[PDB]
Design a protein around this ligand. Structure first.
Ligand SMILES: O=C(O)c1cc(-c2ccc(C(=S)NCc3ccc(-c4ccc(C(=O)O)o4)cc3)cc2)n(-c2ccc(Cl)c(Cl)c2)n1
Length: 123
């Protein structure tokens, strides 16, 4: 409905990446999904997500959620609620958000466009 960015948890990306907040259950839009190079192991999916203010590509899906991508329930433009996630910090200082539980609130086909004009998060 009208004011589409009002459907997303504006400010959640900054909160996750800076405050270390893990209790929140933010609503985010998937902008893009791409497989990461793996080899002899299940694929892993990396996501460019939006909270309506920022985009951030430092999300990965827990492999238990792979069927959501492979059966096309989780795809570009869908709106999702993150019910459980963890944050990992790499040796170089970058942070990665591993999505453990999520719910698709609106399918990609029911949304159909990138919501708002989010700008890349500066980590
Ligand atoms: O090839 C490539 O092109 C490639 C590769 C990677 C990549 C980078 C980091 C890792 C991590 S953070 N290694 C530790 C880890 C992995 C899974 C877990 C876990 C906890 C529960 C589960 C589960 O249930 O599945 O998995 C925990 C620690 C992995 C790949 N990336 C990459 C680079 C930069 C960013 Cl910002 C991102 Cl998001 C990905 N690109």
């Amino acid at each position: 409905g009208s004011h589409m960015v009002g459907q997303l948890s504006r400010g959640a990306i900054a909160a996750i990446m800076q405050k270390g907040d893990t209790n929140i259950k933010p609503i985010l839009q998937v902008i893009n999904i791409r497989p990461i190079t793996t080899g002899n192991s299940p694929p892993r999916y990396r996501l460019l997500m939006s909270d309506g203010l920022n985009t951030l590509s430092s999300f990965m899906l827990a492999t238990q959620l792979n069927p959501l991508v492979e059966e096309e329930q989780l795809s570009s433009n869908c709106v999702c609620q993150i019910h459980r996630f963890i944050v990992n910090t790499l040796k170089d200082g970058r942070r990665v958000v591993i999505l453990m539980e999520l719910e698709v609130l609106k399918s990609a086909e029911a949304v159909g466009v990138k919501i708002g004009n989010p700008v890349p998060y500066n980590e």
